Amino acid sequence: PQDLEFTRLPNGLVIASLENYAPASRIGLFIKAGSRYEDSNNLGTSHLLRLASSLTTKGASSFKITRGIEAVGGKLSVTSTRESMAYTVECLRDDIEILMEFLLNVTAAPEFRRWEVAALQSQLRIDKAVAFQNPQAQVLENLHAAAYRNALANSLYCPDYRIGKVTPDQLHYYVQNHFTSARMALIGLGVSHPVLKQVAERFLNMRGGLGLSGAKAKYRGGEIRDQNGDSLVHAALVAESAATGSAEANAFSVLQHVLGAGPHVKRGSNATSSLYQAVAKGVHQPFDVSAFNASYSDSGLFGIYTISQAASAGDVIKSAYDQVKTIAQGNLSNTDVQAAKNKLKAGYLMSVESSEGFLDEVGSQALVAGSYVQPSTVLQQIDSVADADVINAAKKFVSGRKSMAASGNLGHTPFVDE
Amino acid sequence: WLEGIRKWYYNAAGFNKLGLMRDDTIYEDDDVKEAIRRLPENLYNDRVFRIKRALDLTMRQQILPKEQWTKYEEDKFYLEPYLKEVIRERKEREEWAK
Amino acid sequence: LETWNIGVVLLFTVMATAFMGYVLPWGQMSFWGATVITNLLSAIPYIGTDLVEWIWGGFSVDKATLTRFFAFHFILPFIITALAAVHLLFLHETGSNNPTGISSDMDKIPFHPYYTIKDILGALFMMLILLILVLFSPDLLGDPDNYTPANPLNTPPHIKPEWYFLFAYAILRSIPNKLGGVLALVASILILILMPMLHTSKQRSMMFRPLSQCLFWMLVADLITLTWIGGQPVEHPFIIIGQLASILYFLIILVLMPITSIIENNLLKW
Amino acid sequence: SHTDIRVPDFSDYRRAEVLDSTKSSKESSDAR
Amino acid sequence: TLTARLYSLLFRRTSTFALTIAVGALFFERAFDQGADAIYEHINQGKLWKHIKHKY
Amino acid sequence: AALPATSESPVLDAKRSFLCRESLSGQAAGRPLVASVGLNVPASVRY
Amino acid sequence: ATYAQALQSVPETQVSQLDNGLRVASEQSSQPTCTVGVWIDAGSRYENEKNNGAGYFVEHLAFKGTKNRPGSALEKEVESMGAHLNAYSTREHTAYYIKALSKDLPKAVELLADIVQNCSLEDSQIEKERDVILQELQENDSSMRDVVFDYLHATAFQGTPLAQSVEGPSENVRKLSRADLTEYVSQHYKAPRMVLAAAGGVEHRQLLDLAQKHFSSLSGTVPAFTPCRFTGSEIRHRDDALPLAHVAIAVEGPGWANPDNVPLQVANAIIGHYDSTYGGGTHMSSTLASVAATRKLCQSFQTFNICYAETGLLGAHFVCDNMSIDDMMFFLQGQWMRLCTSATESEVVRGKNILRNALVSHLDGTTPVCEDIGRSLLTYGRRIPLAEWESRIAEVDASVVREVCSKYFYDQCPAVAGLGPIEQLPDYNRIRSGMFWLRF
Amino acid sequence: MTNIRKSHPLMKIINNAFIDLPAPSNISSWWNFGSLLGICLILQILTGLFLAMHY
Amino acid sequence: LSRFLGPRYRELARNWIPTASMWGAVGAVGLVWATDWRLILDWVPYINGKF
Ligand code: HEM
Ligand code: HEM
């Protein structure tokens, strides 16, 4: 099924293509354009930009894009993290030229007409309310606001006061400063490399440079508490860990899977999760606990996420934190680290099974590192991680300053200091 | 000269005697309604006051002083591009519908 | 559209009412006008004669026709009242047009103080004209021969319908063919239903359209010509005058007005 | 508790064509 | 069944339903008037002008 | 797109309750959240 | 490839059988991970009113211990290799599967055989799962879509075992004993009704050797299936405390093996789906989606083709505020009628493209392919290749769509479920009249 | 707690048609002939009925 | 007109032609029946007896 072909053009744009010969083709344009590039004056600009695909472009009207992508059964999706924006077109392999022209019009020639932009402010409210129906969305937003001072402190969602105020000039300035060639990677699964090169030649010649150089994320170490009475309390307690793609980051991944990083068995007991066992020793109420890992280009957050009854919130949090401290005290066997490595490696290989997952991995790799590495190298990097590296990471979390975000009835929730 | 006839007709039409521009007098169908809805707010407010003043003038069966009349060479076709774009979108929808 | 179409319906119904009411005095003009305009319905192919004899209730205009015309004349204005109510219902969905042809929502006023008093003064003026007619020239707009009782064995030397039919009468007398004449007479009112489809101007009103005003006043003068001609005998000068007047009537509405509006559009660079 | 909801038996009102639960009701639909 | 066939052929579409109703109205008027008239002239047999006209 | 999405999006609608530890299991977050929108697909969030 | 050569290059599902009648099916790739599972022809439609819920209860107890792996030991083993154990139950099918590394397939296969063959069904665990299942019933009550589809099944298939819910009524949950569950497993977990599927980096010969080493004990070489009458009917649960109303309307659609399914799916793609978080809104080719976006008539709508062996639910589910239900019905039924009488070729082309895209995009990853293999061998006795699905889609036109939507939708009695502030949900006679057109 | 002219169901529609109806501030005498017609109609029904008492 | 024409509208015409001609036959039969138009009715076998 051929081999991944990865090249970097003189404009700095990256193009990577794997022709797997699958009936469907998937093309993603990955850009360093997340909400970490906003400042205090244009918060929510990139959220409206995420919602702004399928608006009129210089080469195709809004009706043309909607109707002409639905005609071929195609899909146009925009997925944002705090650091990246990925624009994906997926369709059958015979219709990829139409979808690629649409994608290139969307990213390189956006028009941001004032009436279409003013008729899109309502979906900021709709989109954010739908996301905030999950109690974790706002807890993670508050955790980033309380862990950072400036850059990663920015929400993926528009501030409520900024809704109805994100202007077309903010969108134009944003695209002109973040959608540049040396910040972009076009990655096609199920396409030929020369085709992607011709696509990258017909467009994507904005500046061939680095655009606006966003600020370094500054650790804050604060606490945000959202009393809202919800039956459950969601609490996140983190410290600064490491930037993505390092030996320390891999140690933090192994530590996440030592502590427990989500369930493997349906309705199970999370037996191999040491955090879960520590909490279930004393907390006989319904609960969930996992280790939380958030790695970024210039920083990272490692800690614990707990969901519990309002009454038992403190007991769950103290139990989890003391289990982490016990790992920091050098109590960590080789079998548990082998099991954690197996979990991590299996999860990594399973994430790239789908075309969406493999495309996302290749795109993030091309943005963060500017190079592609096969899963075998990733797995042996996981293998290289030693026991002392895990013990460390846990020490760094324990000794590190903490940021906390909780939501629910917090009358029994501790503070960062207690 | 075509422009002699054009300026003659602009004087004879006489909406300039009311302070109106040509695009103020257009019959408001659905295309024109969307075109007016897409105007920037300053142009919309100018249009609204111009039209209100002209209605106030015709209510008295009066016209403005000749100094205040819209000069033919100063008539701003402010609504023309918005209307052309609205009509282009309608025409595209219809071409799709066939 | 909806109020204009209701108005066309109202025009036809008012004409039917007035026509049937004019027969009620049973004078010479009543009888012979009913005779001519009912016999116009025989020109309909196949079912025409049966339709006329059924409307008559007999072989000619006679007792059955008079009593049924009284009944229809009594009932029709109430149908007109309902149609005028529907008319106003449709009109209030948009409000009124205005002389500039421009939407005026930024300058609306309450109806009561302003247009109740304006409509009342208009009503007083209408009453003045009507009372001058009633109290000073009661017979100015009528024919002396309707003061003679109807005589089925003696046709009046002239048979002219009421003045407010004469234009259509002139139109119907212009074309020799019976059925084509009737079709032209009906088209001279059904053509009002074509005005929206024939509108090619960028502007709603003719306030800023000098050439369309010229054509409009030609159409008014031509309708006055047709009224005069329909009041005159079918003789040498009046035949050719009425024929050219009818052709002009249709050629303005269907041809000259849209082309002239297109020319005006181009003169305004749109 | 929504799984505790059962439609009541409508056999008393049913047409004879559809009294059996084990039969396709399409096979009588046209006739019905 | 017969009613399944009638529905499938003549009742499913409203235009064909209406055509069946129109043709049936014509044939029903004919047959119903014929039957009702025969009943009325049997009840009143010999009493009507038609029954006795052939003597005059 | 062609496929409907594991979950459609009612705003102003209570989603689901969690009453058991078995249901609560997996609801804790482990990775930073991503936000996804789509022309013809339900919007999603992931943690 | 040109999508015609790419379909022809898709790997072939290899199928074998054990002497006991267990079918073994695998689609191989070069991926370093696999999904392997057991799909069983067992569901709630196989349960009567006294046993209803037993299959869900057995799925609940599946991973809680076998005679070889007591309690958490099994879970530990799965978790100790990075694998993921999952299970599900429907009214007709039950599945237990593992996502593992390709080198873990032997153990995974072993772990599955044990799970289906030697579940402990311990009474203490049965009581703990009784409590869990009651709490999950109350959790499912909170999901308006799940409730409205249970209601739709209950009224459409009233008097039949297809009206039953998967979980059963809470009274059965409280009353089911170990003897009930052992009887359910002994009568439904049989080799002739099971399929061992595997998709991914799995060689068929090796999987077959594993199945012969771990499943050969199973039943060698009987109550199963009665047809389920469909009923035009409505069930309306009014709760004006609910912010949004859910409405599900379905006619009797075809069963699994009926070719009419392919045109009908095409037709559903013409109507499409929508929710208020869509980019396209007013510009969508689906008329209902564009009207719903322009007028804000609903929060979402979806078409569905639920299939059982011999019947199914063909219809639509929508969510809207109290004052728009009527509109949502009017525009939805109208679309149905517009398809029955005036389908039109270009939107049939669009719907065909949508269907091909749905079929190809769905089969992305080892787990969807493993489910496709298992469920396909249960419903068709075969894995239908995507080239065949494409052949069946290519033979659809507007005449075919008009004919099949006429056969299933036009002048048919629907089954209707309403939940919430549904006072404006139209009366059943009005909906039934909306199922035909007088102009036509 | 309410103006009868706006609350009462018959007065509501009379009010909306002839009192509180927004009318253009600049409609001329040519716009009077609607009400005139409505008056003419009424006159014809009145006189006519009194004529019908003897005809 | 321009907004009309095109393959889709000609296909709609073809789709509705059977229904239109069926309603035409319905109107024809109903008009023949209501007015007792013998010009056609004299050819209908049993109805022929009514004249
Ligand atoms: C029974 C006789 C009629 C009555 C009582 C009547 C009544 C009215 C009234 C009261 C108005 C509002 C006031 C006005 O603008 O004049 C009006 C407006 C109107 N009528 Fe009539 N009308 C009648 C006949 C007609 C006829 C014959 C037509 C022509 C087809 C017509 C078309 C209109 C139109 C288009 C308007 C709106 C005019 C505008 O706002 O610019 N009506 N009618
Ligand atoms: C639309 C409103 C009406 C119009 C346009 C109208 C018109 C006419 C006309 C032109 C005449 C003949 C006048 C003449 O003798 O020269 C007449 C006569 C008559 N009308 Fe009316 N009429 C209307 C309403 C009514 C109504 C509603 C009635 C009955 C209540 C009525 C009763 C009569 C009677 C009895 C006559 C015969 C006596 C007479 O000649 O004056 N009219 N009508």
Please spell the DSSP secondary structure of G136-204, one letter per residue: HHHHHHT-HHHHHHHHHHHHHTTTSTTSS-SS--HHHHHH--HHHHHHHHHHH--GGGEEEEEEES--H
Place of tokens 């329909």: C230
Q: What is the β-pairing status of strands A232-240 and A223-227?
A: unpaired
Strand partners of residue G271 = none
- Distance of alpha carbon C221 from alpha carbon C245, whole angstroms: 10
Please give the Cα distance from C263 to C270 (Å, whole number): 10
G56, with CB counted inside 10 A (0-12, 13-18, 19+), is buried
**Best CA proximity match to C252, nearest among C210, C217, C201, C206:** C217
Is C73 flagged in the annotation as binding? yes
H helical segments located in A109-212: 114-118, 121-132, 135-147, 168-178, 193-202
Distance between first and last Cα of chain H: 52
Dihedral sign, Cα of residue H6, residue H7, residue H11, residue H16: positive
Say whether D31 and E8 touch across the interface (CB within 8 A). no
Instruction: Give dist(CA C164, CA C230) in Å, integer.
Output: 10
Q: Give the residue from G90, G57, G95, G58 showing the smallest Cα distance to G162.
A: G90
Provide the residue type at A83 as one letter.
E
CA atoms within 13 A on the CB side of C49: 2
Going from the Cα of C13 to the center of ligand 1, the distance in angstroms, rounded, reads: 14
* Residue nearest (by alpha carbon) to ligand 2 atom 7: C18
Q: Which amino acid is at G398?
A: A
CA–chain centroid gap for G389, Å, is 19
Give the span between the Cα atoms of C55 and C62, in whole angstroms: 11
What resolution in angstrom units was achieved for this structure? 2.1
Nearest atom in ligand 2 to the alpha carbon of residue C13 is 1
Of A241, A395, A405, A276, which Cα lies nearest the Cα of A328?
A395
Query: Would you say G95 and G166 are in contact if contact means Cβ atoms under 8 Å apart?
Result: no
Chains in contact with C, where contact requires at least 3 CB pairs less than 8 Å apart:
B, H
Strand partners, A25: A91
Largest CA distance in chain C: 66
Q: Of the candidates A69, A140, A262, which has its C-beta nearest F33's C-beta?
A: A140
Q: Which of C2, C50, C63, C118 is catalytic?
A: C118
| Angle subtended by helix axes C28-39 and C2-23, to nearest 10 | 130
For residue E25, what are its two tokens?
Answer: 């109205």
CB within 8 A of G253, min separation 6: which ones? G261, G264, G305, G306, G307, G311, G312, G313, G314, G315, G408
- Residue A168 · residue A112 · CB < 8 Å: yes
Name the region of E45 (left: φ>0; alpha: ψ -120 to 50; beta: rest). beta
Q: Is residue A388 packed enough to be buried (19+ CB in 10 Å), middle (13-18) or exposed (0-12)?
A: exposed
Using alpha carbons, select from A99, A88, A109 the residue that is nearest to residue A179.
Answer: A109
Count of CB atoms within 10 A of residue C89's CB? Answer: 14
- Beta carbons of H38 and B71 less than 8 angstroms apart: no
Is the dihedral angle over the CA atoms C131, C135, C138, C140 positive or is it negative? Answer: negative
- With DSSP H G I counted as helix, E B as strand and the rest as coil, what are the percentages for chain B, rounded to 5? 70, 0, 30
Rounded-to-integer distance, Cα A347 and Cα A344, Å: 5
- Residue closest by Cα to atom 29 of ligand 1: C7
Contact yes or no, G with C (3+ CB pairs under 8 Å): no
The alpha carbon of residue G244 and the mean position of all alpha carbons in its chain are separated, in whole angstroms, by: 25
Question: Distance (Å, rounded) from C-alpha B84 to C-alpha C74?
Answer: 55
Nearest to A298 by CA among A181, A152, A184: A152
Ligand 1 in reach of H42 Cβ (< 6 A): no
What is the rounded distance in angstroms from the CA atom of residue G273 to the CA atom of residue G287?
A: 10
Shortest Cα–Cα distance, B60 to chain H (Å): 8
The residue whose CB lies within 8 Å of the most ligand 1 atoms, and thus the one to mutate among H37, H39, H41, H45, is H37
Helices marked H in A161-312: 168-178, 193-202, 247-259, 274-282
d(CA C80, CA C10): 6
> Which of G344, G349, G332 lies closest to G291, judged by CA?
G332
Q: What number of other Cβ atoms are within 10 A of residue B93's Cβ?
A: 14
Give strand pairing partners of G16.
G24
Backbone angles phi, psi at G62, to 5 degrees: -65, -50
State how far the Cα of D28 lies from the Cα of E54, in Å rounded to an integer. Answer: 58
> Is C205 assigned a catalytic role?
no
> Which ligand does the CA of H24 lie closest to?
1
Task: Give the integer Cα–Cα distance in Å for G292 and G282.
Answer: 8
Contact E30 I25 (CB under 8 A): no
Give the residue from C50, C47, C19 showing the smallest Cα distance to C35. C19
> Which chains reach chain H with 3 or more Cβ–Cβ distances below 8 angstroms?
B, C
D27–chain G nearest CA distance, Å: 10
Distance from CA of C199 to the nearest CA of B (A): 11
User: How far apart, in whole angstroms, are the C-alpha atoms of residue I34 and residue I25?
Assistant: 14
Residue G350 CA neighbour count, 13 Å, CB half: 21
DSSP A309-347: ESTTHHHHHHHHHHHHHHHHTT---HHHHHHHHHHHHHH
User: What residues pair up with G236 in beta bridges, in sequence order?
Assistant: G418
Number of H helices, E strands in chain B: 4, 0
G11 and G25 Cβ atoms separated by less than 8 Å: no
Concerning whether C105 is annotated as a catalytic residue, the answer is: no
| Beta bridge partners of residue A187, listed in sequence order | A16, A28
Q: Is A229 left (phi over 0), alpha (psi -120 to 50) or beta?
A: left
CA distance A189 to A1: 11
A45: exposed, middle or buried (Cβ count in 10 Å: 0-12, 13-18, 19+): buried
Residue G252: exposed, middle, or buried by beta-carbon count in 10 A (0-12, 13-18, 19+)?
A: buried
Task: Tell whether B13 lies on the interface with H, counting CB pairs under 8 A.
Answer: no
| H helix or E strand, kind and range, residue G25 | strand G23-28
Please report where in the chains the tokens 């039917």 appear, as a residue. Answer: C16
Q: Give the HSE-up count for residue A76: Cα atoms under 13 Å, Cβ half-sphere.
A: 30
Token pair 């309502």 in the structure block, residue: A122
Q: Where are the alpha helices (DSSP H) in C106-209?
A: 111, 117-136, 163-174, 178-190, 195-198
Element (H, E) at G304: strand G300-307
Strand A223-227, strand A402-408: pairing: parallel
> Residue E7 has what DSSP assignment?
I
Dig out the tokens for A31 from the structure: 């850009």
Please check whether residue A263 is in contact with residue A249, taking contact to mean a CB–CB distance below 8 angstroms.
no
Closest ligand relative to C147 C-alpha: 2
Closest C-alpha among A374, A376, A379, A350 to residue A362: A374
| DSSP letter assigned to residue C149 | B
The encoded tokens of residue G86 equal 């999952």
Q: Residue A311: count other Cβ atoms within 10 Å of its Cβ.
A: 12
**Chain G neighbors (3+ CB pairs < 8 Å):** A, D, E, F, I
3-state SS, residue A369: coil
**d(CA C248, ligand 1 centre) in Å:** 26
> How many whole angstroms separate alpha carbon A347 and alpha carbon A74?
29
Query: Which one of H26, H29, H30, H31 would you mutate to disrupt binding with B, by most B Cβ within 10 Å of its Cβ?
Result: H26
Residue entry with tokens 């009628």: G337
Q: G84: closest CA among G367, G372, G371, G368?
A: G367
Can you name the residues that pair with A91 across neighbouring β-strands?
Answer: A25
CA I18, CA G406: separation in Å to the nearest integer?
15
| C236 known member of a binding site | no
For residue C192, which atom of ligand 1 is closest to its CA?
30
Measured in residues, chain I has a length of: 51
Check: CB of residue B42 under 8 Å from CB of residue B94. Answer: no
Residue G435 · residue G412 · CB < 8 Å: yes
C199 annotated among ligand-binding-site residues: no
CA G57 – CA G161 distance, rounded (Å)? 17
Taking CA atoms, C239 is separated from C229, C235, G311, in Å, by 8, 6, 80
Q: Tell me the helix, strand and coil percentages in chain C, rounded to 5.
A: 70, 0, 25
Q: Is C4 in the pocket of ligand 1 (CB under 6 A)?
A: yes
Is the CB–ligand 1 distance for residue H48 below 6 Å? Answer: no
- Do F and I touch, 3+ Cβ pairs within 8 Å? The answer is no
Sign of the C-alpha dihedral computed for residues G253, G257, G263 and G265 taken in this order: positive
Ligand 1 mean position to C86 CA, how many Å? 11
Query: CB under 8 Å to A194, separation ≥6 — which residues?
Result: none
Mutate to test the pocket of ligand 1, among C3, C9, C102 (most ligand atoms within 8 A of CB): C3
Residues 6+ apart with CB under 8 A from C200: C258, C261, C262, C265
- The reply to whether C93 belongs to the active site is no
Distance between alpha carbon G361 and the CA centroid of its chain, in Å? Answer: 17
**Residues G347, A70: Cα–Cα separation, whole Å:** 10
The reply to whether ligand 1 has any atom less than 6 angstroms from the CB of H38 is yes
Interface contact flag, I8 G341, Cβ < 8 Å: no
Between the CA of C92 and the centroid of ligand 1 the distance, in Å, is 11
* Cα A224 from Cα C1, distance rounded (Å): 62
Q: Is C92 annotated as catalytic?
A: yes
Atom from ligand 2 closest to the CA of residue C142: 16
Does the annotation place H28 within a ligand binding site? Answer: no
What is the dihedral sign for C-alpha A195, A197, A202, A204? positive
Among C11, C23, C24, name the best residue to mutate to test ligand 2's pocket (greatest count of ligand atoms within 8 A of Cβ): C24
Rounded distance between C-alpha atoms, residue E48 and residue E51, angstroms = 5
What percentage of chain I's residues is helix, strand, coil (to nearest 5)? Answer: 75, 0, 25
Q: Who contacts C29 (Cβ-Cβ below 8 Å, separation ≥6)?
A: C22, C143, C145, C146, C156, C159, C160
* Distance (Å, whole) CA G138 – CA G151: 16
Q: Give dist(CA C154, CA A122) in Å, integer.
A: 82
**Partner residues linked to E5 by β-bridges:** none
- Which of ligand 2's atoms lies nearest the C-alpha of H40? 2
